[PDB]
Design an enzyme around this catalytic site. Structure first.
Site, short mmCIF file in Angstrom:
data_model
loop_
_atom_site.label_atom_id
_atom_site.label_comp_id
_atom_site.label_asym_id
_atom_site.label_seq_id
_atom_site.Cartn_x
_atom_site.Cartn_y
_atom_site.Cartn_z
N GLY H 68 0.80 -1.22 0.00
CA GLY H 68 0.00 0.00 0.00
C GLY H 68 0.83 1.26 0.00
CB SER H 97 5.11 -3.93 0.16
OG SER H 97 5.57 -2.69 -0.19
CG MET H 98 3.32 0.26 4.34
SD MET H 98 4.86 1.02 4.64
CE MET H 98 4.63 2.18 5.95
CG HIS H 122 9.37 -4.04 -2.38
ND1 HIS H 122 9.12 -2.80 -2.81
CD2 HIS H 122 8.22 -4.53 -1.99
CE1 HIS H 122 7.87 -2.54 -2.69
NE2 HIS H 122 7.29 -3.57 -2.19
CG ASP H 171 10.10 -7.85 -5.75
OD1 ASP H 171 10.43 -6.73 -5.49
OD2 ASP H 171 9.38 -8.13 -6.69
#
Lengths: 192, 192, 192, 192, 192, 192, 192, 192, 192, 192
Positions: H68, H97-98, H122, H171
Site C-alpha cells: 500500500g 511491502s508496507m 522491497h 523483491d
C-alpha cells in the site's frame, strides 16, 4: 490534390513535380509540426541528399514548429553541423521549445525571422515511474540533458551561461525584435 | 474522381492536370476550411512558387474559411507582405475570425467579396492550466497578441485603433455591403 | 474500380478518362451528398473552368442531395449568378433544403426535374451556447439569414414574399408536378 | 508528398525516385522506429541487395531507435555478420537497448556516433502467464537469452564478461565520449 | 517509400522494380509474420509462378515468423511437396509453431538456419463453445489434427513418433545447434 | 460514519440525532454545492418546517456554493421572501453566481460574510438548438430573465440599475470588504 | 462493520455508537483525504457543534491529507479562527498543500506533528479557457489569492513575507524536525 | 449478511454486535487489503479507542495485506509507537511491502506469524512528470524516504544497515521460518 | 429481503436474526465464491469467534467454490489447524482448486461430500512481467509454492508425494466416490 | 419499499416482518431467476433452517426460472434429497433447463405446475479454450455430466434412459398437460 503539381521547362520541358519536390530542387526544406522520429529522419535524408548534390551551396530551412521530442530533434541538430554547406534557417509562424533550439543553430549571420513571428524557450520536460533506484538514474540523465542544452544555447547566442540558465526556468516568450536583440536570430526580413 | 482531370492543348499538348493544378497555373490559390499548420505551410509554398515564375503578376487568393490558429494564419500574412507581386483576395462563402484577418491583408484596392458572403470578426481566444506563476506568463502573452492584432486591423482598414478595440469585444457580423462601408473590402463583384 | 474508365477517340486519341472527367468534358457537373465546404469548393472550381473554355455554351448541373451548410451553398449560388453562360439545373432523386434552393437558381426556362423526384423546402436551422449577451448576437444573425433566403426564393420562383414565408415555416414536400405548378421548375422530362 | 521525389541525370535522364530509393543507390540504409519483424525484414532485403551490387564496398547504416524486439533485431544482427562487405554503423539521435546492440555490431573501426547522441543499455525484458510448469519453461528461455546477449556484448566491446554483467543490471546511459571510452563505438564524427 | 525501388540494366536498360519483386526474380520468397489465409495464398501463387518459370531450379524460402493458422499453413506445405524443384528453407530470427513446421518441410539437405536464431515447437491450440454433442465433434477434430501433425514431424525429422509426442507436450525451445542435432535443420550457415 | 451522531439531553435524555438534524434543530440550514432541483427542494422543505415551529425566530442560512440552474434557485428565493421569520444569510467559502444572488436576498441588516470568503457575480448563461423560429423564442426568454435578475440585484443592493448592468457583463470578483462596500453584505464577522 | 461500533458506560449503559461518533464526543475531529466542499462542510458542522457543547475546551483536529480545493479549505480556516475554544491541530501521515495550510492555523503553542510525518507547501494552481478578455480577469483573481495565501503563511509562521514567497515557488518538503525549525509546528510528539 | 451478528451476555443479555465489533471488544484489530488513507485512518481510530479503554492491556493486530501507500502506513506506525499499551502483531496470509514493515513494528517479543505465511520486502516505488527542475525535487524526496525506511528496518530487526540495504534491492521473499531467522518476527505460532 | 429473517425463542423470545447469523449460532460457516482476501478474512473471524464460545465443539464448514488466490486460502488453512475444536468440512456443488485444498484439510474422519458433487485439482497458476532478473525471482517463488502445496496434499490424503506430483500436472476431475477412494474425503453423505 | 412489511399477531403481537420472511415462516421458498452460486446458497440455507424447525412437515418450493449453472443447481438437488421432510415443487411461469431439472426432483406425488406454465429441457452447454490436451480433458468432463444428468431424469420421470437421451438432443418444449403425460409433474393445479 492535397498537394498540387507544377511543370517546368528545361531541355525537353516535360517534367512535372509535386510542389514540395519542386522546392527541394531549389534547396528548400520545410520543418513543420511536432518534432518526432519519422519526421526527423526524413529531414535528415533530405539534407544528406542535398549535401551530395552540391557541397558548395547553401540549404534553406523554413521552420514553423511548436516543439517536440529532444532526442529526435538532436539528430537534426547534429546533421546540420556535420554536413559541409551552410544551413540558413528562417523562422515563420513559430519556433518554440525544440523549434527555437534548432532555429538558433543555423549558420551564423544567416539566422532570420519574419516580423510577426514568435520564439519561445524553456527547460526540457520529462518523467518516469519505477523503483526509487530507477528514479534516481533517470533523474540524473534528464538533468545532464538540461545542462548540455544550456551550454549549446550559450554557444550559439553569445549570452553567458548563467544568463541562459535563468532565462529558461519558465516559459519565456520573445517577439521578433527581441529575438534579434537577445541573440537568437541575426535579422528580420521585411520586404523583397 | 474526387478531383476530376482536365485536358488542355499547348505545343504538343496533350497534358492533363488535376483541376486544382490547372488553376494554380492561372495564379489562383484557394484557402478553405480551418487555418492550421499543414495547410498554411502548403499555401506559403504555393505563393513562393508563383512569385518565382513571374514577379510582375498578381496572385488571386480565394477565401472561404471559418477561422483557425493564429500562428498558422500569421505565417500566411507575413509571406503576403513580403513577396513582390500583389495578392488580391476574394471572399466567397465566409471569412470569419482569422479568415477575415487575412482577407483584409490583400493589396489595397483589390479586396473584393461576393454579394451573399459574410464576414465576422472577434478578439482572439486561448487558455492555460498550471501554477499561478505560469498562468501569469501565459496571460500576458495572449494580451500582447490581442493588442498586435488590433493594430494590424486599424492599419489595414483605416479605422482608429479605439474603434477597432470596441468592435472586436464580441462577435461582430457584417454583410457584404457592410464590409465595404467598414473598410474590410474595397468592392463587391456582381456579374461578369 | 470504384470509378470505371472510358475510352474516346479524336485525332490521335484514344485517351482514357475517368468516367466523371469524361462528363466534365461535356459540360456536366454533378452535385451529390451533403453540401459542405470542401465539396462546394470543388463545384466552384469546375464552373470557372468551364466558363473559360467556352463562355457561349450552357453548363448542366445535376442535383441530387439532402441539404447542407448554407454558407457553402451560397458560394455555389453566387458563382452561378456571376459567370456568363447559363447554368441549367436538373433535379433527380431529391433536392431538399439547400439543394432545393440551388435548384431554383438555374437559368429561367431551363429548370427541369425528373417525374419521380421530390423537392422539399424549409426555414434554416442553427443554435448556440454562451452568455445571454452572446446569444442575442447569434440569434440576430440567424434571423437575418432567414430573411435573406426568403427574398431569394420569392425572386426566383415568382411567389410573393408573404407566400414564401408562410410556406416555409415547416417542412413542405412537393412532387415533381407540384414543383412545376409552384414555380420551382419549368418542366418535367419524360422520355427522350 | 510525404516523401519527396528527386531527379537525376544519366544518359537520357529519366530517373525519378523517392528520396529514400535515391539514397539506397549510394549504399545508405536507415534504421528508425521500433525494431520489429516487418521493418527488420526490409533492412535485410536491402543489405542483401547491396551485397550483390558490389561485394567490395561499404554499406552505411544510420541508427536512430529506442529499442525493439530481440528476434527481429537478431535477423539483422546475423545478416550483418554473414555478408561480405563491411557495414559501418552510425548513431544519431539515440541507440537504445536493441538499438545499441546493433550499433556495436558494425565493422570494427567503423562504428561511429555523432557528438550529441545517446546510447543506453540494459538487460532484456519479457513476461508470461500460465501454469507453474509453463512459467518455469519460459523463465529459463529468457535467462538463456540474457546470457547470450552478454557474451556478444563482451565480444564486440572488449569488456570482460563480468563487467558487462554488472553494467546492464540497470539502465545505463552513456554520452558520446563515454561510448567511445567504453568500447561501444570507435569514434565521434565531427565534420565531414 | 515504405518499400524502395531498385533499378537494373539489361539491354535497353529500363527496369524499375519494387525491391521485393526484384528478389522474386532471383527465386527468393519471404515468409514473415503470422501465417493466415491471405498471406498464405500469396506464397502459393509465387511458388507456382517460379515452378513454371524454370522447373529445374531451386526456390529459396526465408522464414521469420511466430506461428499462425494450421489450415492456412498446410496449403503452403502441400504446394511445396507437389511442385517439382526443391524448396530450400532458411530460418532467421525465429520459426515458432507452424513456422517451425514449414521450416522442416523443405528439401532434405537444404534446411538451414542462422546461428542466433530460435526454433520453438508445441502441440496445436484451439477451442469451442456449444452443446455437449457439438463439443465432442470439435474435440475429436482437433485431436486428429494433433495426430497428423505429429506424423509429419516424425517423417521429416527422423525422430520416432513417440519421441515427437513427448517433446511437444509443452513449449519446447531449441537453439540453432540443437535444431541441428534434433534434426529440424541440416546445418548452420556462418559466413560468406 | 460519513455523518456522525451526537447526543443531547432534554427530559429523559435519550436523544441521538445525526449531526445535521442536530443543527436543523438550532434553526441552521446549510446550502452547498450546485443549486439544482432536488437539492433546492429540500432547502425549501426545511424552511417551511422551521417557519411552522416558530414563526417569530430567525433562521440562519449558511452559503457555500459555486452556482446553479436559476430556476431552482428562484424557488429558494421566493420562499425566503414569503415565509414570515427573517432569514439571515452567511457566506463562507464562496458565493458565486446564483449563490451570490441568494446571499444578498437575506434580511436587511443581517447579511454577513466571513473575512476570507469570495463573492462573484455575472449575467446568466444558456443556449439552444432548433429552427430559426424557435431560436427566436428561446433568445427572448433568456433576455427577459437577464433583465429581471438585474432588477432584483439593484433592489437588494442599493446600486442603480445602470450600475448593476455594467457590472455583470463580465465575471466580477469581490473580496469580503468589497462586498461590504458594494452593498452585497452588511458586515464581516470576525471573532465570536 | 465497515466502521465498528463501541459500547460505553454512562448511567443506564445502553450506549452503542459508531467509533467516529465516539471520538467526536471527545472533541476529536479527523480531516483526511482531499479537501472539497461536501467534506469541508461537514468539518465545519462538527466544529460548531463542539463549540456549543463547551466553549472552554480545546478541540483536537487530526490531519492527514494531500491537499484540495482552496475555497473549501478556507471555510474551515475561518471557522477555526472564529469559534471561541482553541483548536489544536495534529499532523499524522502527511499535510500537503492546503492541508499544510490548515495545520499551521491551529492555536499557537498547540501545533504538533508526529515524527515520521511530512509537510509540503507550494503556490496554488488553477487555469481557464475563453476570450483574451476573460483570461485576464481570471488571471488577476488567481494572483490575488496567491498573495493572500502568502500573507497568512507569514502571519502564522513568523517568517518574513519575502521568505515565504521564495519558499513556495516550487514544492518544498519538510520533515517533522524541519517543520518545527521553520515554524509550521511547535513540537513533535513522541510517546504518551 | 455480509457480516453476521453475534450474541453475548453481560448483565441484561441484550447484546447483539456485528462480529467485527465483537472482536474489537477483545482488543483485536484486523488490517487487510491495500493500505490507503481511509482504511488507515480507521485503524488509527480503533487503536486510540482501545488505549483509552485500558492503558494496561495489549492490543492484537492481525495483518494480511499486499502492500500500500507509505504515507498512510506511516500514520499507523506512529500510533503504534505513541500509545502506551503494547501492540502485538500477527501475520497470516501475507505481509508484503508496507505490510511487512508494519509487522516488524510490533512490541519486541510479541511479533508472531503463522507457519504457511509469506513475508516480502522491497525498496519504495514512485514516479513523476514535469520540468527537469521539478523532477529534481521529487526524486530527491523519494530517496530520503528510502533512507528512512531502511533505518527503521535495521532498528527493529537487528540487522546492520548495510545488510538491510542489500536485501531490499529487489523483491525478497521469506518463509515463516526465514522471517524468524532474519529477525522480522520473534516466533511462529503452531497450535493452541 | 435478499436475506430473510428468522425468529427463535430462548427466554423472552425477542430474537430475530439474519438467517446466516442464525446458522452461525449453530456453528455453521459457509464458503462460497472465489477465495480472496476480504471474504477469507471474514471466515477467519467467524472461526475465532466460535472457538471462544465453546472450545470443545465441532465447527461445520460448507464448501462450494471454484477457486481462489491461495494466499487468502492459506490464512483459512492455518486458522483451521490452529484452533482447538475439530473442523468438519462438507463439499456440495464443487470444490475446485483451492476449494479442494481446503476440503481435505478438515479433521480426519470428518471430511464428507454429497454424491453428485465434483472435486477438481491442479498445480497453481501465476505470472509476471519485467526484467529478466525479476522474472527469475518471481519464477522461483511460484515453484516453492507448488512444492509446498504438494507436500500438504500428500500429508492429508495419504498418497505418496510422487503420486500427487503426477496427478496435478493437468486438471484432474474426481466424482464423489472417486474422491473417497483417492482419499480427499472420508465418505459420502446420503440421507439424514 | 422494494419489499413491503407485513404485521401479524401472535402473543403480545409485536411482529413486523418483511413479506419474504413472513412467507418463510409458512415454509415457502421461492426460486427465481438464473441459477448461480450465491443464490443457490441461500436456498440451501433456508432449507436447512426449515428442516431443523420441524422435521415432519413439508417444504414448498416455488420455481420460476430460465435456467442456470449446473454445478450450482446440483447443490440444491442434493440438499433436497438429503433433508428429512418432503419438498414439494410448484412450477409457475417457466421451468427451463436446470429449472426443469429441479422441478422433477421434488417428492413423488407432490410435483405440480400451474396450467399456463411452460417447461423446457435440453442437454448441457459448455466450452473451453486451450491446448489440444486440455480440450480433451474438458470435453470428457462435460460428456460425463451429460450422462449423469440423463440418468437422473430417467430415474425421476420413469422414461427409459434411451428415450431421455433422444429427447434432449434439441430443445424440447412442453405445455403443462404434456409435462403431466411425460412424467415431469404429477398434476396441474386449478383452483383453490
Amino acid at each position: 490534390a492535397l498537394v498540387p503539381m507544377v511543370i517546368e521547362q528545361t531541355s525537353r520541358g516535360e517534367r512535372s513535380f509535386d510542389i514540395y519536390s519542386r522546392l527541394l530542387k531549389e534547396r528548400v526544406i520545410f520543418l513543420t509540426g511536432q518534432v518526432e522520429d519519422h519526421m526527423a529522419n526524413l529531414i535528415v535524408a533530405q539534407m544528406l541528399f542535398l549535401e551530395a548534390e552540391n557541397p558548395e551551396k547553401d540549404i534553406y530551412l523554413y521552420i514553423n514548429s511548436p516543439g517536440g521530442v529532444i532526442t529526435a530533434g538532436m539528430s537534426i541538430y547534429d546533421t546540420m553541423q556535420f554536413i559541409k554547406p551552410d544551413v540558413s534557417t528562417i523562422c515563420m509562424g513559430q519556433a518554440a521549445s525544440m523549434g527555437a533550439f534548432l532555429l538558433t543553430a543555423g549558420a551564423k549571420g544567416k539566422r532570420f525571422c519574419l516580423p510577426n513571428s514568435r520564439v519561445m524557450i524553456h527547460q526540457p520536460l520529462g518523467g518516469y515511474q519505477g523503483q526509487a533506484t530507477d528514479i534516481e538514474i533517470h533523474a540524473r540523465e534528464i538533468l545532464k540533458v538540461k545542462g548540455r542544452m544550456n551550454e549549446l544555447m550559450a554557444l550559439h547566442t553569445g549570452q553567458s551561461l548563467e544568463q541562459i540558465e535563468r532565462d529558461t526556468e519558465r516559459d519565456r516568450f520573445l517577439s521578433a525584435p527581441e529575438a534579434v536583440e537577445y541573440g537568437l536570430v541575426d535579422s528580420i526580413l521585411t520586404h523583397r
